[PDB]
Protein backbone atom coordinates (compact mmCIF):
# COMPACT_ATOMS: atom_id res chain seq x y z
CA UNK A 1 0.00 0.00 0.00
CA UNK A 2 1.31 3.49 -0.22
CA UNK A 3 1.43 3.43 3.75
CA UNK A 4 1.97 0.39 5.82
CA UNK A 5 0.19 -1.01 9.11
CA UNK A 6 1.19 -1.00 12.34
CA UNK A 7 2.01 -5.00 13.97
CA UNK A 8 -0.23 -5.41 16.92
CA UNK A 9 0.28 -7.82 19.60
CA UNK A 10 -1.26 -8.26 23.31
CA UNK A 11 0.87 -9.75 26.33
CA UNK A 12 0.15 -10.65 29.51
CA UNK A 13 1.73 -9.37 32.80
CA UNK A 14 1.86 -11.26 35.85
CA UNK A 15 4.40 -11.40 39.20
CA UNK A 16 4.79 -14.61 41.37
CA UNK A 17 4.29 -13.70 45.09
CA UNK A 18 4.65 -15.56 48.13
CA UNK A 19 1.55 -17.41 48.88
CA UNK A 20 1.52 -17.95 52.63
CA UNK A 21 -2.01 -20.59 53.82
CA UNK A 22 -4.83 -19.57 52.85
CA UNK A 23 -4.26 -15.81 51.13
CA UNK A 24 -6.20 -14.77 48.10
CA UNK A 25 -3.73 -14.64 45.36
CA UNK A 26 -3.74 -11.37 43.27
CA UNK A 27 -4.13 -11.70 39.84
CA UNK A 28 -1.93 -10.02 36.58
CA UNK A 29 -2.53 -7.67 33.85
CA UNK A 30 -3.15 -7.79 29.97
CA UNK A 31 -1.67 -5.23 27.47
CA UNK A 32 -0.97 -4.33 23.83
CA UNK A 33 1.82 -2.89 21.81
CA UNK A 34 1.99 -1.65 18.21
CA UNK A 35 4.49 -1.29 16.08
CA UNK A 36 5.31 1.95 13.97
CA UNK A 37 4.22 2.58 9.92
CA UNK A 38 6.21 3.17 6.96
CA UNK A 39 5.46 4.37 3.59
CA UNK A 40 6.93 4.50 0.47
CA UNK A 41 7.23 7.28 -2.33
CA UNK A 42 7.72 7.20 -5.86
CA UNK A 43 10.92 8.45 -7.82
CA UNK A 44 11.30 9.06 -11.73
CA UNK A 45 13.39 11.13 -14.26
CA UNK A 46 13.11 10.84 -18.46
CA UNK A 47 14.83 12.15 -21.69
CA UNK A 48 13.46 13.69 -24.58
CA UNK A 49 15.42 13.40 -27.83
CA UNK B 1 -42.85 -53.98 57.26
CA UNK B 2 -39.61 -53.01 57.22
CA UNK B 3 -38.65 -51.46 53.89
CA UNK B 4 -34.94 -49.45 53.11
CA UNK B 5 -35.78 -47.11 50.22
CA UNK B 6 -32.32 -46.27 48.05
CA UNK B 7 -31.77 -43.87 45.28
CA UNK B 8 -28.34 -43.49 45.39
CA UNK B 9 -26.18 -44.99 48.65
CA UNK B 10 -23.13 -42.96 48.04
CA UNK B 11 -21.64 -40.42 46.31
CA UNK B 12 -18.19 -39.16 47.21
CA UNK B 13 -17.89 -36.11 44.60
CA UNK B 14 -14.82 -33.56 44.30
CA UNK B 15 -16.53 -30.30 45.31
CA UNK B 16 -15.92 -26.55 43.96
CA UNK B 17 -12.69 -25.00 44.85
CA UNK B 18 -11.79 -21.52 45.37
CA UNK B 19 -8.44 -21.32 43.01
CA UNK B 20 -8.08 -17.96 44.23
CA UNK B 21 -6.88 -19.24 47.69
CA UNK B 22 -5.15 -22.75 46.23
CA UNK B 23 -7.78 -24.99 48.20
CA UNK B 24 -8.31 -28.25 47.35
CA UNK B 25 -11.88 -29.62 45.93
CA UNK B 26 -14.57 -29.65 48.84
CA UNK B 27 -14.46 -33.37 49.47
CA UNK B 28 -18.39 -34.04 50.28
CA UNK B 29 -20.47 -37.26 50.62
CA UNK B 30 -24.08 -37.75 49.79
CA UNK B 31 -26.63 -40.23 49.97
CA UNK B 32 -30.26 -40.42 49.30
CA UNK B 33 -32.34 -42.75 51.32
CA UNK B 34 -35.09 -43.24 53.64
CA UNK B 35 -36.91 -45.98 55.78
CA UNK B 36 -40.29 -47.11 56.46
CA UNK B 37 -40.45 -48.15 60.14
CA UNK B 38 -43.87 -50.47 61.85
CA UNK B 39 -45.23 -51.16 64.84
CA UNK B 40 -46.72 -54.96 64.01
CA UNK B 41 -43.61 -56.44 63.69
CA UNK B 42 -41.55 -55.39 67.11
CA UNK B 43 -42.10 -56.28 70.43
CA UNK B 44 -40.06 -55.00 73.80
CA UNK B 45 -38.99 -56.51 76.48
CA UNK B 46 -36.73 -55.73 79.66
CA UNK B 47 -33.69 -57.20 80.43
Known sequence: PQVMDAKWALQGNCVFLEHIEGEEIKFGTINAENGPVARIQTYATGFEY | ?47
Open chain 2, 1 to 47: GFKELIKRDLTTEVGNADLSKLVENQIVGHCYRGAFAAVEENVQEIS
